[model samples]
Target: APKAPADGLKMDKTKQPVVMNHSTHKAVKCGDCHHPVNGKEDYQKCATAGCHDNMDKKDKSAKGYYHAMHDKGTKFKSCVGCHLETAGADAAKKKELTGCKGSKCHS
Candidate 1:
């Protein structure tokens, strides 16, 4: 396993704690989640101003920090969305893979 980052950011946006295991995810490139915008990696926080700053809003469509991070709509390429996609791919190959609700994650 790769060495974990010094500051392992833990996102507690849900009932469970989502630990950002840099070591486990070292295989994936940074651009996977921090996609480059205009050829620059937008590594800004979800609550950054002018980005996902609508924290007061509670609607599902609200472009708040939570929505920006979680993006449960399945439209955005979120962490959960990626896991679901991987699960689908594994399923297509007739492999047993766990998804967001499986033992590998939320379960």
Candidate 2:
């Protein structure tokens, strides 16, 4: 995996860029965020041209970039959903993972 980046990878897709650290997410399976097809995982970015590139949350389809990472009702169990599970009763944890400003995802 080319010795996974220890630093943060900037995600410039949003209004404000978000920095994601592979080091912080070492415990998660890549498949959790990647799509596997024909017994192989597709390492393409989630926002690939024809994929979840749609940024409008109101679209609500599978192609919505907003939906891909924040929707909670589907089996996808997006970033927000998983963090929500981990933050159960800890208000601090919830804020870090789910909050908009100065939060882990948005910081």
Candidate 3:
């Protein structure tokens, strides 16, 4: 997750095309995003079956991809949550990374 392929990471498997430029996240360890299953590190897709497959944003049970990405009060720092901190009072930064539809992530 930290070092993406030369072509960069594209989270485009879903209906809404998303891109994950792993280079931007190279500061963190891969284990931060790639979870552990039983005692082994698992790099399965986040929205894959039995993982964060729930599509509803309202379901904050750690099973929804949307929830996992947008939730701020959960165990992990969601995309938005982490971005919020990174942006801090920088409105332009928020508009850049947190805008639901026009943000850098969704578009």
Candidate 4:
């Protein structure tokens, strides 16, 4: 049986607690977020040493998750970017897609 969704997962460096609905995202493959490295799925801390050690860097070469997702760096895609790309147009046209805060997915 699928396990119950875990609550209080933090996003970014704000340490803000958020709930991730696994059932809602069951259709999304793990690789969508937990990207595969070297043909193996190795999940690690976003701020791990030798990895995304700094969350504040904004350079294109920054290895931080913040840069990787929000800034121009790796081809690594972003949930927010994807959401904006797909729903942003409809949202803009309908005036419905209020940023990512307090939404059904990010609240």
Candidate 5:
């Protein structure tokens, strides 16, 4: 049988949907965060894309973008982690954080 076009790359909506308050990033596809396999539609394993891609021991210090992002101490570089949860009146209390620039993702 011929190969079928891959379209099952949808994100796990059951989990938090990728959200952006600004127009520039709202429409950004999941593929931007998750790279697809070459000549195939399978998404690249998150561990295989950055530090783990090259298997460099030096890069291992960074490990993955998740670590690097948080280490940078910059808003854009940091992953939201679990802070995306709603503040108060929801699972998260009002004390829930609103920023990612400084978090425990790094040492």
Candidate 6:
């Protein structure tokens, strides 16, 4: 069965917001974040299902999903660079890079 849309399913200008600077990664598309791989237009694909489905089954829980990726450099710091290192050297501080929002990738 298909999953239902999230409560009050209006466009959230905040959750899973794209990074304008990272727009250089053309391989990354709106559907990459907005729709499911099967080509379904479900916001849950971004808010409920994981960003990289290879990582987790759920996206809303992506905080931990990103943390695990950062620790192992699995995606070669893709998640870390945006979520951890945003401005300066401190961004390189892996230990300092904890939580999903503090790193400024989500906020």
Best by lDDT: 2
Number of clashes found in candidate 6: 3
lDDT of 2 by residue, 16-39 (tens): 777778878778877767766466
Ranking by TM-score: 2, 3, 4, 1, 6, 5
Tens-digit lDDT track of model 6 for 1-107: 54333333332343354333433434555443344445564445333444434343233233344343344333334445543544345544544354456443444
Residue 9's lDDT in candidate 2: 87
Q: Is candidate 1 or candidate 5 better by TM-score?
A: 1
- Tens digits of lDDT, candidate 5, 1-107: 22322433332222322332323333544444333445443444444554234333234254443342223343223334224423434533323344422322111
TM-score to true structure, per model:
0.55, 0.85, 0.82, 0.62, 0.26, 0.27
User: 2 or 6: which has the higher lDDT?
Assistant: 2
Off by over 4 Å in 5: 1-28, 35-42, 49-69, 72-78, 81-107
In order of lDDT, best first, we have 2, 3, 1, 4, 6, 5
lDDT of each: 0.55, 0.79, 0.77, 0.54, 0.35, 0.42
lDDT of 3 by residue, 1-107 (tens): 33345545677655876777777887866766776667665778888899898887688786888888887886667788888989989999999988777789876
Q: In candidate 3, where is summed lDDT lowest over 10 consecutive residues? A: 1-10
Q: Per-residue lDDT for 56 in model 6?
A: 38
RMSD after Cα superposition, model 3: 2.4
Error of 1 at 89 (Å): 7.3
lDDT of 5 at 55: 35
Clash list (residue pairs), candidate 5? none
Q: Write the per-residue lDDT of candidate 1 for residues 10-29, one digit (tens) a residue.
A: 76644565566666666677
**Model 5 TM-score on a 0 to 1 scale:** 0.26
